[PDB]
Amino acid sequence: KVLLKVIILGDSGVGKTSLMNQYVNKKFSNIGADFLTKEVMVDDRLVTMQIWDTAGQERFQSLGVAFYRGADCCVLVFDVTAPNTFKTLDSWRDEFLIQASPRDPENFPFVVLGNKIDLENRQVATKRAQAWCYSKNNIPYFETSAKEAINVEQAFQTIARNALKQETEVELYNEFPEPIKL
Amino acid sequence: DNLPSDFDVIVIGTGLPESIIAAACSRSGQRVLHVDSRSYYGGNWASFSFSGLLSWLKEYQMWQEQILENEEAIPLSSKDKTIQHVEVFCYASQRITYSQIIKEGRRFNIDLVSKLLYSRGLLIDLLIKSNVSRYAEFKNITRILAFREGTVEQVPCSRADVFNSKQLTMVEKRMLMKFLTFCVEYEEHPDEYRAYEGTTFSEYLKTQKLTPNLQYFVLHSIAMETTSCTVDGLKATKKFLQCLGRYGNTPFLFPLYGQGELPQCFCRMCAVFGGIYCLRHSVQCLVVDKESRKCKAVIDQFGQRIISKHFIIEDSYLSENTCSRVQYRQISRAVLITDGSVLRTDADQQVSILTVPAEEPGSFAVRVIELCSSTMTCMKGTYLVHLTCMSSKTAREDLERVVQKLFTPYTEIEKPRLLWALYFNMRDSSDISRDCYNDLPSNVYVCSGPDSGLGNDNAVKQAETLFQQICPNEDFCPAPP
Numbered sequence A: 001k002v003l004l005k006v007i008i009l010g011d012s013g014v015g016k017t018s019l020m021n022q023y024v025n026k027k028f029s030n031i032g033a034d035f036l037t038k039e040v041m042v043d044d045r046l047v048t049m050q051i052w053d054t055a056g057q058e059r060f061q062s063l064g065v066a067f068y069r070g071a072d073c074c075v076l077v078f079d080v081t082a083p084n085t086f087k088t089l090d091s092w093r094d095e096f097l098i099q100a101s102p103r104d105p106e107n108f109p110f111v112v113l114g115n116k117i118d119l120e121n122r123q124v125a126t127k128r129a130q131a132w133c134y135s136k137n138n139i140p141y142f143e144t145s146a147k148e149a150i151n152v153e154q155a156f157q158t159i160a161r162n163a164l165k166q167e168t169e170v171e172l173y174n175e176f177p178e179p180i181k182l
Numbered sequence B: 001d002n003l004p005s006d007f008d009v010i011v012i013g014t015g016l017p018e019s020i021i022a023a024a025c026s027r028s029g030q031r032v033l034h035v036d037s038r039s040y041y042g043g044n045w046a047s048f049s050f051s052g053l054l055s056w057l058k059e060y061q062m063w064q065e066q067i068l069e070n071e072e073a074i075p076l077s078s079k080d081k082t083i084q085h086v087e088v089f090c091y092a093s094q095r096i097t098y099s100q101i102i103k104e105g106r107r108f109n110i111d112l113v114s115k116l117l118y119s120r121g122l123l124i125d126l127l128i129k130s131n132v133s134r135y136a137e138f139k140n141i142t143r144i145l146a147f148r149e150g151t152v153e154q155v156p157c158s159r160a161d162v163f164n165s166k167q168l169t170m171v172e173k174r175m176l177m178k179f180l181t182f183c184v185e186y187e188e189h190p191d192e193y194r195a196y197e198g199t200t201f202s203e204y205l206k207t208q209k210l211t212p213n214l215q216y217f218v219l220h221s222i223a224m225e226t227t228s229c230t231v232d233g234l235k236a237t238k239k240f241l242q243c244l245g246r247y248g249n250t251p252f253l254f255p256l257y258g259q260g261e262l263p264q265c266f267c268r269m270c271a272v273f274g275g276i277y278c279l280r281h282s283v284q285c286l287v288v289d290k291e292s293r294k295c296k297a298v299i300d301q302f303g304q305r306i307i308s309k310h311f312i313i314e315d316s317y318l319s320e321n322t323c324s325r326v327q328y329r330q331i332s333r334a335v336l337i338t339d340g341s342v343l344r345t346d347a348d349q350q351v352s353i354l355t356v357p358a359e360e361p362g363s364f365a366v367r368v369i370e371l372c373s374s375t376m377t378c379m380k381g382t383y384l385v386h387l388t389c390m391s392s393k394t395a396r397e398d399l400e401r402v403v404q405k406l407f408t409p410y411t412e413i414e415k416p417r418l419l420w421a422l423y424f425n426m427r428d429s430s431d432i433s434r435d436c437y438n439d440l441p442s443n444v445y446v447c448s449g450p451d452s453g454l455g456n457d458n459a460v461k462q463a464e465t466l467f468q469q470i471c472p473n474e475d476f477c478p479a480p481p
């Protein structure tokens, strides 16, 4: 059973928790988010995707190091109607690199999600975001709506694929056996 | 976002006990606020990357206006004083050089607390019941070690081990099995040890059907200072035997990435149930109703007054005035970066615990835990070695002798090479009664820092005792629904 650890980063209120719930449970709410798992297909291969939620620890920027360990893909989210959340994207990416300290940093899989497109007053332009993602080693960009379930399943397809590639490279270098789980 | 002005419980400090109680209170439905004045989790229970640890080292080398006339303030500490006598030695060049340790600094997770997890015990039970176990992974301790005339050797840890031992006579094997069979079910033979309840375990063993060689092993490798009563030794011996084989051949496990991960595991549970987290956020003082005498709120470093019903504070945050009468104990610690195991073998990824009895009376027994790179606490090519003992003098004074006999600080000539060494004493504030502190409001609860025991019963027990006081009649850390 190949297992992929995905974490969702970004400022409070952009929809990180709703995006996780929409993907996995195909539901959207109007109170105990932790981490969900889903058996997904990545190019004809069945894999277990484990998606970790910040449990609100980002509200006051208090996510500790243990949250980041072993991550195979880091999802960065911003609210398309809130330019402020788009501007912090660089800080969260830098924070992931410092906290997770992955091998071959510059090639780590980041995926950017411009969420809440269902809202009629967007303020961050698609072109402007695509450009930013491009200036960071051509990071894949997707515009989503956790509420109207738009592009969510599609975005997680590349997240899964990119996370599988990373974890596979990680296992290739791993000389140690599997650790014990209680 | 902006901090709420009222909570049910405010916890100051993110050490292990504080985090278990925060998680317990949040899980039960209390609105919890958990702060730490540091920029990282764990207090004195934290682990560090190599640069993180260098940063940590350095350190140890007005609200009055808002107080109404019917209130009084209890200022909290502004400076942590739990760490003393820091001494760092770098023996590597300034194959492995100091430059290489720095380069791979992020591969290190160096614990301020050197402990193991008993396969059967309060913490592992709590981790499994609460489901906090899902937040971590572990490695089996594979070897129990001891000194056999200046030489480190592996000690028997199973029936198979006793069978294949060529160091014990046939009569000794028989003696041992007979005695450990009894220890396992000792409380069922009262008169068997009844006469020796008021004597030391060491003395008791001398009156048993065991050679002195065997008695030494029982005392130092199984029961694990020297004046402990007979019953204390029997309980210890039984616990050890009972833990055998639950996850591996020995009774211990060690968390991947280090002990420093545990406090964060419980804080996550707290967060998952709505607890609010603020690192880099200290508290200036407690606000006490002059009349009722109960703590009403705190005033944080930004002058915000926050209300709560309960206030849990780790000892290091209390002022010197509040603690003027307290008598603390001290723990001697050493952290070593080495280039080879204390007991070389084909298989290098061994995780071991070596006990070093005091050479002369007056000092305490020393514990040495050797972590291999697969524990994810040190870079490939090295081992991380932790030494611990109740303090007699400074940590280097209590520990350098042991370091001297296990490693060489030179590149040119058996002994593995000691590359880097850190010595420090950590305040031991465990087992201190509330009454020792001055004018504590009844709704202010005090958590201690790390204790010197091998396991974590002290942290778990104090957390459960506090939880009972704050959330009476509630289940302690039930699994999430």
Ligand SMILES: Nc1nc2c(ncn2[C@@H]2O[C@H](COP(=O)(O)OP(=O)(O)O)[C@@H](O)[C@H]2O)c(=O)[nH]1
Residues within 6 Å of the ligand: A010, A011, A012, A013, A014, A015, A016, A017, A018, A019, A029, A030, A115, A116, A117, A118, A119, A144, A145, A146, A147, A148
């Ligand atoms: N209209 C709209 N609201 C959304 C969407 N995703 C999340 N939200 C709402 O925005 C708020 C914050 O969402 P939450 O998932 O808790 O995001 P988090 O703080 O980043 O983890 C909630 O009030 C959600 O209902 C979306 O795609 N569209």
Ligand SMILES: C/C=C(\C)CC/C=C(\C)CC/C=C(\C)CCC=C(C)C
Residues within 6 Å of the ligand: B155, B156, B157, B158, B159, B161, B162, B176, B180, B181, B184, B217, B218, B221, B222, B241, B242, B244
């Ligand atoms: C659950 C309880 C059992 C199985 C008790 C019987 C004891 C056994 C099978 C002993 C295992 C052997 C050791 C712990 C060896 C210790 C020997 C030295 C330290 C010389």
Ligand SMILES: [Cl-]
Residues within 6 Å of the ligand: B116, B117, B118, B121, B122, B123, B124, B454, B455, B456, B457
């Ligand atoms: Cl334990």
Ligand SMILES: [Mg+2]
Residues within 6 Å of the ligand: A016, A017, A018, A033, A053, A054, A055, A056
């Ligand atoms: Mg959320």
